[PDB]
Amino acid sequence: IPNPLLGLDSTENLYFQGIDPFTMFEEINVVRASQLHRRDRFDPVPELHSLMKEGGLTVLGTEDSTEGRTAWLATGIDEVRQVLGSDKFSARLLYGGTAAGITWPGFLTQYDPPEHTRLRRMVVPAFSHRRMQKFRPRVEQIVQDSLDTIESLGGPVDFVPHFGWAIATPATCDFLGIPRDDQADLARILLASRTDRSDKRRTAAGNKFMTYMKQHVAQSRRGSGDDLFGIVGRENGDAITDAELTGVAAFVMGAAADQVARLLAAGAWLMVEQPAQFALLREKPETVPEWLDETMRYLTTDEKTHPRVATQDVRIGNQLVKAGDTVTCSLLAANRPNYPSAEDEFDITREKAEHLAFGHGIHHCLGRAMAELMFKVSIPALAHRFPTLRLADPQREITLGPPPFDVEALLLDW
Ligand code: HEM
Numbered sequence: 001i002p003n004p005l006l007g008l009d010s011t012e013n014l015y016f017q018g019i020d021p022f023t024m025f026e027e028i029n030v031v032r033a034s035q036l037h038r039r040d041r042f043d044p045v046p047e048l049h050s051l052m053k054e055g056g057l058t059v060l061g062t063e064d065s066t067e068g069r070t071a072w073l074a075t076g077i078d079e080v081r082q083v084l085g086s087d088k089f090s091a092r093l094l095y096g097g098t099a100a101g102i103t104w105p106g107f108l109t110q111y112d113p114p115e116h117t118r119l120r121r122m123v124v125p126a127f128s129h130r131r132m133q134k135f136r137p138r139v140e141q142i143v144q145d146s147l148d149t150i151e152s153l154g155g156p157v158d159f160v161p162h163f164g165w166a167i168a169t170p171a172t173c174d175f176l177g178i179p180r181d182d183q184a185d186l187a188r189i190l191l192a193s194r195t196d197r198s199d200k201r202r203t204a205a206g207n208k209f210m211t212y213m214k215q216h217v218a219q220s221r222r223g224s225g226d227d228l229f230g231i232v233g234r235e236n237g238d239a240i241t242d243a244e245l246t247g248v249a250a251f252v253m254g255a256a257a258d259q260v261a262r263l264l265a266a267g268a269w270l271m272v273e274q275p276a277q278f279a280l281l282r283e284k285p286e287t288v289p290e291w292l293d294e295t296m297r298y299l300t301t302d303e304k305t306h307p308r309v310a311t312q313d314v315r316i317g318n319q320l321v322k323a324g325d326t327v328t329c330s331l332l333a334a335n336r337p338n339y340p341s342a343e344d345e346f347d348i349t350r351e352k353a354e355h356l357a358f359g360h361g362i363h364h365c366l367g368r369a370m371a372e373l374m375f376k377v378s379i380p381a382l383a384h385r386f387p388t389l390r391l392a393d394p395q396r397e398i399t400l401g402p403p404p405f406d407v408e409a410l411l412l413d414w
Contacts, residue, residue: 025069036048042299044333049339049340051073056079058072070325082316084360085360085361089327091306092111093311094307094326108366125235139374145166150163150386151385159268167261170183175370256367259301262406270299275390282383304404308329335356
């Protein structure tokens, strides 16, 4: 029971007869974690900076009960690696108890070993570095086409649709063997499923996407294509279900496409804020071999991991994480430990890398090679194409939406 006589926070104050107290505990902690991972331009917000000073693991929130659950945030590099690498944390127990089945087939984030292990191993060959080498000429074409479109239009151009999404959409679709003719409509359907203010219309759009994808999976899984479905289907036969394949494909075209569009937009923004450094990349790329790792570290466009649930009492740093507690990891805090300082500032010439932008442990980014391929093609190509790239209006702040790192618009000229 919140006490609205004492405080002003709307989220904290929500109460009505018959409200679920546990649902409320989980939801306010998600909101708290989210608030902490907004950004101040490229930087952590003061609240996260303050929290980082407290120690490597702090209390996000606690349940009203005697011997109730605690939600923790890990911010120290040591604590984050320890949590994410430990077999004493479950991902699946976040979504239900032991006896609960899988909710979203193919949503790897939701699986624990041994089934996490098997399903990931089944799909891994499609995401390999070798496979990304093969995919590279297509990505190069996608990027040059996007740049041609931008240049043809004339400045100013919004790089969110014309750079982030113009690359992410065809790249993800092509990876899944989606015919060119279908792509614009699917992207439109996905927009409705991600943004429509009506939850009813949001679900109808999601349903429309998932049924297209189920059909596409059935058509493609026994075929001879180099798409994800052909690869995984030919290799695995009936060991992978249509539902599982559909989930993986949907993730790639939905959540993951959004993640890469956001990363590319954040990259283009950094380029216009740090043009002398990116001039070094354009003109002498061999002298800055760690540029990409440093960019990932600085940007950390996925600020935090999904909460993990402790399956037994476990020591994390100083603290005792009790069975049933959750720990959320701040990749942002892990990658920017020295914020603010000269050493934390973006430095394209840095050695040794860091970093944890793609997570850690068994759940670490399956799409790392694909994401890096996209970035490593896109950013240098942008630099060569528009050496004079700049903000159309240098006085206007970039508007950031809710995490993860969400550039809403990026109006650039050259
Ligand atoms: C199209 C490109 C991408 C694909 C296909 C992809 C795919 C995936 C998948 C399937 C997982 C779940 C792995 C598992 O649970 O075993 C994952 C996890 C993760 N990804 Fe990606 N990803 C992409 C881009 C990105 C980008 C741009 C970032 C941010 C830099 C990112 C950051 C992460 C992180 C931090 C995790 C771990 C989450 C956690 O531990 O809770 N990914 N990725």
